[PDB]
């Protein structure tokens, strides 16, 4: 149950990376913001992988 939480921590870090990159480019001509999409990694149901 450690890898499952580590994966969520990594996903939150990626989200915050995207948010910081968007903020840093607040005034940058021709910049289009980014958005991170997440999907679960269920193996065979009844158990999660992160």
């Amino acid at each position: 149950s450690f890898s499952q939480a580590v994966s969520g921590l990594n996903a939150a870090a990626t989200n915050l990376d995207v948010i910081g990159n968007n903020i840093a480019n607040s005034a940058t001509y021709g910049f289009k913001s980014g958005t991170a999409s997440f999907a679960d990694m269920f193996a065979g149901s009844k158990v999660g992988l992160g």
């Binding site: 149950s1 499952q4 999907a39 990694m41 009844k46």
Partner: protein, 260 residues
């Protein structure tokens, strides 16, 4: 090697399963179209050392005999199918469901999975696909010379070409509904496949006999509630620690039994 040790070795495993469910729910707090899990437990064997109700004398029965029990086992983790809060991404390609239906998507091997994630993209050939690159049914194609994509509340996908005042219909998006939504088998990547406990896939149009409504520019977020998961972590941690204390007490009893 002793009964209480096995019982407390089942308690540990059940609480570890509960922690696994909680951690998996908290890790996917941001994935769109997510349904959180709930683990259910049930009692194990019950040794009938004294069967309840045995006829001790010829007229007196024994009430509630010596029924020493075994530990616990989890039946399953069930998906709590509720409507997640909708958000406004304002991307003509994001669609959200308002009812209890599913999108149908064709897997590369020829079979069909079902997803509630509405973040759709367009491939190089112009077909609507899931963000994982899986082509969504019914294969709605989008011309190269497209100016705006309009997906209505009934699932009709329309494309307005250049300099033309009337939209062009390029397909019709349909929703699949099941008798039991919980019984679907999750295969990851926000995809569920049909299982015999989920009945059969009933295809329906969005607004009729029970398919949900589609809103364009909206994304369905997860239904995971952070505070409840925090409280559940506290209770599961305490239960795990107490069961470990039971393990330790059994260990001490065995040690000072052997030492005499």
């Amino acid at each position: 090697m002793i009964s209480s040790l096995w019982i407390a070795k089942t308690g540990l495993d059940a609480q570890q399963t509960n922690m696994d469910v909680i951690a998996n729910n908290l890790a996917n707090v941001s994935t769109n179209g997510f349904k959180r899990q709930r683990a259910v437990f049930e009692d194990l064997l019950y040794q009938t050392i004294r069967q309840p109700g045995a006829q001790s004398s010829e007229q007196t029965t024994l009430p509630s005999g010596l029924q020493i029990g075994t530990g616990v086992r989890p039946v399953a983790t069930e998906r709590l199918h509720s409507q997640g809060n909708l958000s406004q991404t304002n991307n003509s390609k994001d669609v959200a469901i308002k009812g209890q239906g599913f999108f149908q998507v064709m897997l590369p091997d020829g079979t069909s999975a079902y997803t509630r994630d509405g973040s759709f993209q367009v491939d190089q050939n112009g077909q609507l696909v899931t963000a994982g690159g899986f082509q969504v049914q019914p294969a709605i194609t989008i011309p190269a010379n497209a100016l705006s994509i309009t997906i209505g509340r009934d699932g009709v996908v329309s494309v307005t070409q250049q300099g033309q005042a009337a939209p062009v219909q390029v397909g019709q998006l349909n929703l699949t509904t099941f008798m039991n939504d919980t019984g679907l088998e999750s295969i990851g990547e926000n995809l569920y496949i049909e299982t015999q406990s989920s009945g059969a896939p009933n295809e329906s149009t969005p607004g009729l006999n029970g398919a949900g409504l589609l809103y364009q520019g909206y994304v369905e977020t997860s239904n995971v509630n952070v505070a409840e998961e925090l409280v559940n972590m506290i209770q599961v941690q305490r239960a795990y620690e107490i069961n470990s204390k039971a393990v330790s007490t059994t260990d001490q009893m065995l040690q000072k039994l052997t030492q005499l």
